[PDB]
Write a new protein. Structure first.
Lengths: 56, 109
């Protein structure tokens, strides 16, 4: 159980350290991670695709 | 950062290095610590959890510890592939969420 929680921390870390996202986009993604952990992967993927699309 | 990690460290191969992190009784003082390995352009990797337990597949050269409001990660027989940024993570009861350190760069000469 502690292992699964630790794994959950990873998505939070990644999304927290995506530099091309807005504050509102980042906060929204984090809130998604809190409200539905089973969607973690999905959320992360979406976040990634946004962070790439808004690259300089 | 809520958690304060140790400064960057450079060591030769086969040396043993220990990175540390300090917090409060609202996080480290009351919750176990996780350690994350971050390589450039790669997804972060879970190295340790529950203070001293190794994630599946992680080399036993990594060891962890927690006492009081501080924790540390020890890497024995340092290797070139150990060069990376290491981050500490834990739960904070005051913030009711995850808190992370600023990271510590480990450079292998």
């Amino acid at each position: 159980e502690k292992l699964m929680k630790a794994f959950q921390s990873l998505a939070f870390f990644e999304i927290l350290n995506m530099p091309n996202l807005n504050e509102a986009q980042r906060n929204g993604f984090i809130q998604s991670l809190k409200d539905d952990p089973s969607q973690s992967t999905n959320v992360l993927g979406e976040a990634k695709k946004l962070n790439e699309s808004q690259a300089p | 950062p809520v958690l304060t990690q140790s400064p960057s460290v450079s060591a030769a191969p086969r040396q043993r290095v220990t990175i540390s992190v300090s917090g409060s009784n609202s996080n480290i003082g009351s919750n176990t610590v996780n350690w994350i390995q971050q390589l450039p352009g790669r997804a972060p990797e879970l190295l340790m959890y529950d203070d001293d337990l190794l994630a599946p597949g992680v080399s036993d050269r990594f060891s962890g510890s927690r006492s009081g409001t501080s924790a540390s990660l020890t890497i024995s027989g340092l290797q070139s592939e150990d060069e990376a940024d290491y981050y500490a993570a834990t739960w904070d009861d005051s913030l009711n969420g995850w808190v992370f350190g600023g990271g510590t760069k480990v450079t292998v000469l």
